Structures are given as C-alpha cells and as structure tokens.
Amino acid sequence: MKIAILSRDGTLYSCKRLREAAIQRGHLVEILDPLSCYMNINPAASSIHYKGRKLPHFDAVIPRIGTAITFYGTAALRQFEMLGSYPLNESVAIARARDKLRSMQLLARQGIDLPVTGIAHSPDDTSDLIDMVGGAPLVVKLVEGTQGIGVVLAETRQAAESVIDAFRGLNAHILVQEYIKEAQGCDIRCLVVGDEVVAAIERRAKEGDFRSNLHRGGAASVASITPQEREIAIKAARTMALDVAGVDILRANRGPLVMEVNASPGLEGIEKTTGIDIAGKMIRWIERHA
Amino acid sequence: MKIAILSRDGTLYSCKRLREAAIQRGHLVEILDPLSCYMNINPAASSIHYKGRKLPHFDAVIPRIGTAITFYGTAALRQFEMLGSYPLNESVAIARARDKLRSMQLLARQGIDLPVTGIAHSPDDTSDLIDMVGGAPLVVKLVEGTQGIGVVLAETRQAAESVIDAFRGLNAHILVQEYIKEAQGCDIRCLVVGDEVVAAIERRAKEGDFRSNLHRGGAASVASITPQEREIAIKAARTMALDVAGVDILRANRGPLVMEVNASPGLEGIEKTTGIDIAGKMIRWIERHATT
Amino acid sequence: MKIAILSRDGTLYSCKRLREAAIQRGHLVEILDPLSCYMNINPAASSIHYKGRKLPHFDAVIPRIGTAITFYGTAALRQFEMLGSYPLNESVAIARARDKLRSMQLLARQGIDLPVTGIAHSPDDTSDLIDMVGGAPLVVKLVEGTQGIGVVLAETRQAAESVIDAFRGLNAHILVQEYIKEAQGCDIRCLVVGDEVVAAIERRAKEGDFRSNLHRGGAASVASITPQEREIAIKAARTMALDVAGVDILRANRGPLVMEVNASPGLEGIEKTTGIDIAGKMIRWIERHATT
Amino acid sequence: MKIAILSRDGTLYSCKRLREAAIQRGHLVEILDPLSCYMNINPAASSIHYKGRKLPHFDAVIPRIGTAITFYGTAALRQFEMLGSYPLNESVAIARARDKLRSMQLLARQGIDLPVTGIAHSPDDTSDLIDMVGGAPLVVKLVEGTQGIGVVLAETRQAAESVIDAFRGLNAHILVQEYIKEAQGCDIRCLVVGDEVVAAIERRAKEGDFRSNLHRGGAASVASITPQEREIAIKAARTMALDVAGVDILRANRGPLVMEVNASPGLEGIEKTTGIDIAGKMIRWIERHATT
Numbered sequence A: 001m002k003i004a005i006l007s008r009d010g011t012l013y014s015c016k017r018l019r020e021a022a023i024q025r026g027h028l029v030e031i032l033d034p035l036s037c038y039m040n041i042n043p044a045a046s047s048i049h050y051k052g053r054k055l056p057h058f059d060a061v062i063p064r065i066g067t068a069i070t071f072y073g074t075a076a077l078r079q080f081e082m083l084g085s086y087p088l089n090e091s092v093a094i095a096r097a098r099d100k101l102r103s104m105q106l107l108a109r110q111g112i113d114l115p116v117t118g119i120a121h122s123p124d125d126t127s128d129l130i131d132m133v134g135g136a137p138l139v140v141k142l143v144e145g146t147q148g149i150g151v152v153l154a155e156t157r158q159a160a161e162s163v164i165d166a167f168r169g170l171n172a173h174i175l176v177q178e179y180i181k182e183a184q185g186c187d188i189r190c191l192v193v194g195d196e197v198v199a200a201i202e203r204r205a206k207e208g209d210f211r212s213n214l215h216r217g218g219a220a221s222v223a224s225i226t227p228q229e230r231e232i233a234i235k236a237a238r239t240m241a242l243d244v245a246g247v248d249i250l251r252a253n254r255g256p257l258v259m260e261v262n263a264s265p266g267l268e269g270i271e272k273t274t275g276i277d278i279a280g281k282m283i284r285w286i287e288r289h290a
Numbered sequence B, C, D: 001m002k003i004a005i006l007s008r009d010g011t012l013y014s015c016k017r018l019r020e021a022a023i024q025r026g027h028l029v030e031i032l033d034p035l036s037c038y039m040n041i042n043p044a045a046s047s048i049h050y051k052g053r054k055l056p057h058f059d060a061v062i063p064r065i066g067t068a069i070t071f072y073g074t075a076a077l078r079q080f081e082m083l084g085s086y087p088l089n090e091s092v093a094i095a096r097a098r099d100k101l102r103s104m105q106l107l108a109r110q111g112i113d114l115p116v117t118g119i120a121h122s123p124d125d126t127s128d129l130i131d132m133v134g135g136a137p138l139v140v141k142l143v144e145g146t147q148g149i150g151v152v153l154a155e156t157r158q159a160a161e162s163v164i165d166a167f168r169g170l171n172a173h174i175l176v177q178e179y180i181k182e183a184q185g186c187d188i189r190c191l192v193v194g195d196e197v198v199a200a201i202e203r204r205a206k207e208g209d210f211r212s213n214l215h216r217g218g219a220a221s222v223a224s225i226t227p228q229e230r231e232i233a234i235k236a237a238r239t240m241a242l243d244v245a246g247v248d249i250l251r252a253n254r255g256p257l258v259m260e261v262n263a264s265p266g267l268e269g270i271e272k273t274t275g276i277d278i279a280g281k282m283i284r285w286i287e288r289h290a291t292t
C-alpha cells in the first residue's frame, strides 16, 4: 500500500516511527509537509502538487496536523480524501477536535463524564460565574493554551475572582473548571486506536504543582487503567469520530473524567514508557480499513 | 415567541431591523452579545447566564456572529441549540461556512460552477501554481485561518509572483483565482431565505476597482436574475446547509460562477436598494420552523 | 494659524471639540488619520502625503495618538516636527509616557511620591515579590509591551500569588502596587495645560469596584486640590516633558501620590463635569508657543 | 570587575563567549535572565531581586535583550543603570533602536545616507506612494519583519501595486524602498565596538534571490571594508548612541547606504567567519569605560 504521512515534523520521533513501521510492513511511504501541497480545487478531483511535481495516488494518509495549521492542513487532507485516500482520522473530525469548546460540548452531550466546566469570554459578573461552576477550588484555563501555560489553581474564592478578572483583559475564551484535587496531580493518558486502548501512562506533576504537563516538569510512568477507564477512553474517541486519539483522564471520586481528546497524540513518551509498538498498531488499523 | 438575536453589533442596522420586524409580528426579542454569555457545558445543556442573570428559554436564536469571534460565538449558539432553541443557521453550518477553503471545496465537490481556483500556503514553485489557474490576470485572496486578509488583482505574472513571494512565511494561505474581467466590477448578490431567493442586487465596483462590495464604495441596483442564477443561489445555500445566506455570483462569458456564500449577509444595502422586507422573510422562516 | 489634529478618531467628541475651538479662534484645522499619512523619511524630513496629495505646512500639530498605534503614530508626528510644526506634546515625550515602567522610574527618580510599586515579569519567588511592596491587599497590573491588559485587586496573598502564576508564560509584565483603600475608590484627575491645572476632578468608582475609571461606572465631582497637589500635578506633567497631560492622583494617609500621567487625556467627562473650555486652553497654549 | 550579562539566551554562543572572554580576562561574571529580575521602582533605585535573592552590585552590565522583551529587559537594564552599573549600550538607546521607524528617521535627519525610503501603514493612493519613493523597482517590506520574511522585490510598477495592496490587509507598518540593484544581493555587516569597526563580513544572497539573510540561503564571507564604510558604520552607531552595534550597509553607485542598525548583534557567524575575538573587544571596551 502507498501511504502519505501529512506532517511538518517529518524529522521528529512520531513521524519517523510511523514511516519505519509502515516500511517494515512492506508499504511505500512519503512524508508530505501540508504547507507545501498546492492544488486546484475547482475543478474538483484535481491532483495535488508538491514541489513542482504532481503527487501520485495514496491509498492512505496519516494526518499529523499541528494546531497552528489546522485550517490549511485539513484542507490539504480534505483534498486527499476526495481523491480516494483513506485517512487515519477524517478532516471533519480533526477540525472539530481542534475546537476545544465544541469537542467538550459534544462529549458532555453524548454522556461522557467531565469535570463541571463553565465557559466564558467577557463575563460581566465574576461571582456569578464562579458560583455557576460551583465555587472554589477552581482551575482557570485559557482555551487556546498549551503546555499548562495559562492553567492556574485558584484555591480560594478571592484567588478565583482575581484570576478571572485578570484574564478578562486578554480577549480570550476561558474555562473555569472544578478542581479534581483527589487526583493528586496525576492524569491518565490513554492512546486509543480504533476500538481499543492500545497504551496508557500516568503523568504526575512535580511536588508543589498540579499540572502533569511534561514541560511543567511532569513525570511519566506505566499505568494500571481500569475497565471503566478503558471504556470511557474508547467511547470518547468514538464520540469524536477519531480512529486515533489521545484521551486524558482525571481520577475523581465519582469516576474517571475525560479532560482532553487529542487527534494527533505524540508517540515518543508513551512508547518509550510502555514498550508498546503503537505506530505498528496505527499501520495495522490502516491495513484493515483502507 | 421569544427570540434571541446573537450579535455583538446590536446597534447596527441589520440587528435593529431583525428586532423591529420580530417585535412588529408580536415576538419577544432580546439582543445578546455572544461574548457576554457564560455557561456550564458540563453537565450537558445547562442554562446560559448573561450579565449576572440566568437567561430564559428562547424558542429561536438568530446568529449574526462576527468574523473575529466564530469559536466562542458558535459555542454560545450551540448551547442555545442544545437548550432547544431553533437556530436560523446552525452552529455547524456557520462554522463550516466561515472556512472559505472548506466551503469552496464543498461547493466544487457538489458540482456548483466556480471560477478556476487554486489554493496554496507555502508553495515552493510559484510558476507551477500560477499555471494551475492559467496565468495572469489573476485574483489573489490572502487568509489567516478563516479571516480574510485581502483581495488583490495581479495583472501580470510578475505581480502574482511578487504577492505569493511576499506572503511566504506569514502564516496565510492563498487562493489564486481566474479573473472574471467581463464582469467589469459587477457581481450579483442573491439573498436566500430558506428555499427562495428573496432579493437580488447588482453591485458595481468603484472607479479603478474590481471589488464591488458596497463597504468599499459599491453602487447597488436591483438585479433581474435568470432562473439559472436563482436555482444556483438556492442550491449553493442548501449545499452549505444554510437557512439564510448571501450568494455572490459573477456573470462570466461561460455562465454564472459562484464566488462567495455568506451565512450573515448585511441587510442595509440590499433592503434599501430593493425595498423588500428581508428581515421579515427571516422572521417568517422562523415562525414556520420553530416550535412553541 | 494652520493646525493639524493627528488622530484616528476625528469622529469623537475630543477631536471635534478641538477643531471647533480652534476654528472659533480663527484657525484653519485639518483632522488627519496618522495611519493614512505616508512619507519619505529619507530624504530627511520630506513632505507628508495623505490620500493622494502633498499636505501643506502646518504651524502646529495636535497629537491624539491611540494606544494601539504608537510606533507609526509617533513616526508621523516626528515627521511633522521635522517639517517645523509645533507639537502640542512632542513625540519623544509621548513615546516615553506610553512606557509606564520607564515613566514611574523617572517620576520616582525625580522625587515625586507614588504608591509603593514593584515590577516583575516571570519572578521565581512570588512571596519575595509580594513582600517587596508590603503584602496584600495589592493591586496587580498586567501589561503587554506598553499596552495595559488589566488592573485587578488581590485581597489576599494567595490571590496575588495566583494572578502572578496565571500570567507566567503569557508574555506580560506585572506591576504590583500598594493598594490605597483609604482613598475609598476615588482618584483625582487633574488636567494640566502648560503651567496650570486647567481642571481637576474627583472620579469615584461604583460602589462595587475599586477602578475609579470613567469607562466603568463614572461618578465625578469638581475637586478641591491641595497647594502641594497643584505643585505635584504640574511637576509631574513637566518631568514627563508633556505640555498637555491628565494626571491621576490618589489621596493617601501618607500624602498625595501620583498614580498615572496620560499624554492624551479625554475631554468629554472632564469638560461637561466642569463646564470649562479645556480645548480652548489647549488652542491658547498653541497660540502662545507656535511661532507664526 | 563584576559583570552581569543580561540575556534570556544564557546557553547560546554569544553569551557563552562573553562570559568566557570576561573570565579569561579576570572578571567575575553572572548571566542573569532579565525576565527573572524583579524590583521596587518606587522607591527609586532599590536593589534588584532574582530568584529570591538580592543581587549584588555589578560594575558593568552587558545587555543582550531580545526583541520580544524589549520593554521589560530595558526596564531591568535601567534599574542596573540607576544602581550605578556601566551598561554596554544604555537602556534608552536600546529602546530607541528597537523602534525601526524612529531609528531610520534619526539616521536620515543626522545626514547618514540611506536608500530613499517611504513609510506607510494604510495608504489610500498606492500609485502616489510608489511615485513618491521614485518608482519601480522597489523593495517592499514589513517594518516588524525579521530574517527577510515579508521582504519582497517588486521589479515593475504592477508588482509594486499588487504587493502594497496585499500588505494593506495586514494592518502593519511597511517600508517602500529604493532597490539597490548594483549591490547584487550582497550586504556588508559591520560590528562596531565603541569608536571602531572590529569585524565585517559580506553576506551574499542565494542564486535567484536578493536577500542576504542567513535563513534565506545567504552565504557569509570575509569583507573588504573601505575607509568610508568604516567611518559610516562608526558614525551610525554613535548617532544612535550605541556602544556595540551591528551596522548593515548596501553598496550603491552613489556610495554606501546604511540599511540597518542592531543593538544586539549576534557574534557566532561573524566571529567564525573572520576569526576575530569580538567578545574580548566588548569586554575591553568595558574595562576602558567602567569604573571598578
């Protein structure tokens, strides 16, 4: 089979592993920077050009589309889909998953448990919003945030007022979210391929922090996930219409809460922590559905 | 009926006209800034709060969501939808429609005639790209995400090459498009409501300009649209799953080409030029498809 | 005399009132959007063009530059200065005044009394920084370059810690400031023209806020200001090398403290609350210092 | 003496070389991240804290403040200055140098030869602007651009029209500049320390390109600088009151033209291309001008 990996990070571990795994299974592989594809849209069916050349047909495309290029990357992916390529994650679902508020609304509407989460942009009554979510302790987050930057624990009502008031000046969407204190700074990161969780690790915040992000000094280790946790990760991915998804879970008293769904999970940390061949399993899903 | 109009621009002509027409037909109307809505999304479909107060149920919501606020705006609209409010244009269709690339791809894929159009972001062979749409004169449209940056005519291959080179590295993608010179700065805006074109104007670009948008100096006149153009406007609107849309058509030598489908068309120019009660048609659509 | 008013807002009260007042006194006024000015900077001091024409010489220019467009704004003002125009606030002083950190560093170095104020960006010991100013309650001011993001009250040490933590990584710096509650949510906004306070007001935040800001629930009476307070306000304006300046003072047990110096103070609130012709005082100062 | 290097980039080549060179010459050195510095500004000239501790007095500070942090870095620098440290480049001069329009206006007004350079932001007559600068061929570039991104050669009038129209949608300051064809894509980068040029390199653009930037394929070699070019680089640095500066020069038919002045020139390319110990020369300047 002929497989395109659609990513700007072709030098990086996850793309190199997907290429190696596909070649090892006898497939032909090309790594394509989405930003280098250009194409006639009207007329439709028109072939994709790349560095002055006309790309061949690809049986499958593996999109690995950075947050910064979602709109154009999915446009390139959409073109491959119209030419008949099988996509490991559809353009429609990648664009939806990039929309964090929409994704959370969908998850909540389909029965998936999440922390009590309020959304706001320019709220004019800070106390009302704090009470609407249920009072301190609260985690305030910027929706378009990464690496734990703009994610803060407001333990008291006054901290929550001050943080929400300060974030107002930024003209940005925010989450105000119930603090899962009993998780003790740990989250469970599952990687879902198809109908199964293929791998899971635990990420643990440093002492003095509650954010498990690696960039914020988090530590990864092998996890023991429950049947319920497996089930919620698989159901979250299916609800998002993703064939491949990272799902981050917080362990609350009342059960697992889905915190995040990522359409382009990194392979390095979870593969190296667990020893599982995740890239191989992505390739096998492709073999079974293209 | 209780109708919310979702817009930051509650003072502007179109929001006032929608309010006026629904009030005249007996409906209770609130004009709500999406950015002032705050709400629990979990648990599902919790009430929407607004300036210290919890909002009542609305039977319908009219989204007039600004270009710079799609993500939050559509989330607010989606919350109304999960609360049971009927939307004049759904959140999903609105979000898709803001994506010009995705929309042109969908219209082309569904067989609607458009000008020859290539897309690019960081092309590494500009000559190949220009050749893709057949050379200058060309229109280049530059976009950051879904926000339009600008639309320029490039009269020579050199001009087009310079524009594309200029934007390399600026995180903007590029629509390169055949120039419909025979339009001589005129396009045809059809305003679709439900299954009808309810008004149609011809917009004529200023002197020394190809861009006929009234907000740049366009002169508007009433247009007489062929049944071909009328069926194309309605099919363009239905393909995008939009209940209200403005469909811009260029009259090329070979036939009518769709240029743009807009989920939130301005009402002022078209209402004044045609004297049609367009806001009223929108309220009627609501009356016919919303419950209670 | 021929007078240019440099502002994006030739629509709003202050600019119309400045043009009105200047015409009243026999001057020819033109309101010019700085962003519409274009010019050669080399050749040194070339003539400024504007919407297709070469502008005439202006004997004076009144800069009313918006926060958001300082770099081009001051550049255009600088060019007028080089062409010989008299500036009502020159570009060097305007540029320095937009930089709060630098400006307070100047005012304190020049011996004016301010609230205890600390600055930080990504401090690694937030309690050290809070103890630097004397603990909570604190005011925290978030700034991006020269553009204020917001001002908040931290009633506790925990709240202050959390605001600082919240902004780590956001590319904003932080002023931490002793909170003047004995000022009971009210500040004094004096308007300095040259050597005199032309008007002074007590501005009172709504019961429910500490920001005595006028865009946020303005209540304001005519003020009765100390001899020391007149001295201070004029001295603040002059240390900043500003000819026209709003000076906001906070009333403290310790004496009066300068809280802000604004090169481009609004006229509407202050003029109607005092009836004073402040624009007229500005035009007069031009008459007194613009040669011909 | 005790020397602080004020830089985010403590592990990068230039700061390591400065630290090495200062240590070799017997000084005590500390690399300090400006963003980790925090301090009272009122009261004036109190100690600078850093990761919980009070910093000792430094006899000299070497600022290496990135563009994105100009305003906070220079505030930190100013505080060291107020505490008596000698700065290798004063904060006020670094702050002005970050303002490219202001710096070009200053160099031009002081009689330093630059290319003819028009500035614009929202020009409303593209043709008038093009003619004001002198006509095609022109280089159009974003004022805030870096590495040559957003720098484009418009060889013809129509290319210039299209590029300028396209850039207008960015809401950004632009330069429209005489194109120095006879330079053949080479620029001379001089590094001035005090009253001399201590090193110079020629950067030559890749084939088919005119931009000599490293990231656009530029090739560095050792340069043969004329007495005239030496004098202009030193005078350009002196005019902007910088003690250390990179000065980029184009060789035009009429003479050398200053294209750029950088207060924080990188050391790696120029040192490795020439074999000159530049860091040591910066330390030597400090020894000659800083009291211990």
Ligand SMILES: Nc1ncnc2c1ncn2[C@@H]1O[C@H](COP(=O)(O)OP(=O)(O)NP(=O)(O)O)[C@@H](O)[C@H]1O
Pocket: A115, A139, A141, A145, A146, A147, A148, A149, A151, A177, A178, A179, A180, A181, A183, A185, A186, A187, A205, A210, A211, A212, A213, A248, A250, A259, A260
């Ligand atoms: N409600 C919460 N309760 C407890 N811990 C939380 C909560 N929200 C976030 N965290 C922790 O903070 C980390 C960062 O939050 P997260 O929402 O993942 O933002 P992000 O990583 O910066 N952006 P994204 O890539 O979209 O996840 C999580 O991985 C958790 O360890």
Ligand SMILES: Nc1ncnc2c1ncn2[C@@H]1O[C@H](COP(=O)(O)OP(=O)(O)NP(=O)(O)O)[C@@H](O)[C@H]1O
Pocket: B115, B139, B141, B148, B151, B177, B178, B179, B180, B181, B183, B185, B186, B187, B205, B210, B211, B212, B213, B248, B250, B259, B260
């Ligand atoms: N291919 C084309 N050929 C001829 N005229 C065109 C073409 N594309 C656009 N125009 C003209 O340019 C005008 C502006 O086009 P348009 O694509 O609608 O951009 P815009 O309204 O200025 N901003 P946006 O609608 O967000 O892209 C149109 O109304 C036409 O009059």
Ligand SMILES: Nc1ncnc2c1ncn2[C@@H]1O[C@H](COP(=O)(O)OP(=O)(O)NP(=O)(O)O)[C@@H](O)[C@H]1O
Pocket: C115, C139, C141, C148, C151, C177, C178, C179, C180, C181, C183, C185, C186, C187, C205, C210, C211, C212, C213, C248, C250, C259, C260
């Ligand atoms: N230390 C303080 N103690 C008491 N009140 C303060 C203090 N600092 C600021 N305020 C209040 O906050 C208001 C606004 O803060 P300010 O420092 O003026 O920030 P800003 O950039 O000017 N935003 P704004 O003034 O509202 O346009 C002032 O007018 C005061 O009423």
Ligand SMILES: Nc1ncnc2c1ncn2[C@@H]1O[C@H](COP(=O)(O)OP(=O)(O)NP(=O)(O)O)[C@@H](O)[C@H]1O
Pocket: D115, D139, D141, D145, D146, D147, D148, D149, D151, D177, D178, D179, D180, D181, D183, D185, D186, D187, D205, D210, D211, D212, D213, D250, D259, D260
């Ligand atoms: N007017 C001009 N004539 C000829 N070549 C030019 C001209 N302007 C720029 N160049 C070339 O293009 C390169 C990039 O232009 P430049 O103005 O230096 O922008 P930049 O380096 O990407 N941003 P900056 O860090 O501020 O210098 C220069 O180094 C020259 O090689």
Ligand SMILES: [Mg+2]
Pocket: A248, A260
């Ligand atoms: Mg996360």
Ligand SMILES: [Mg+2]
Pocket: B213, B260
């Ligand atoms: Mg349009």
Ligand SMILES: [Mg+2]
Pocket: C213, C248, C260
């Ligand atoms: Mg103020």
Ligand SMILES: [Mg+2]
Pocket: D147, D148, D248, D260
């Ligand atoms: Mg350069």
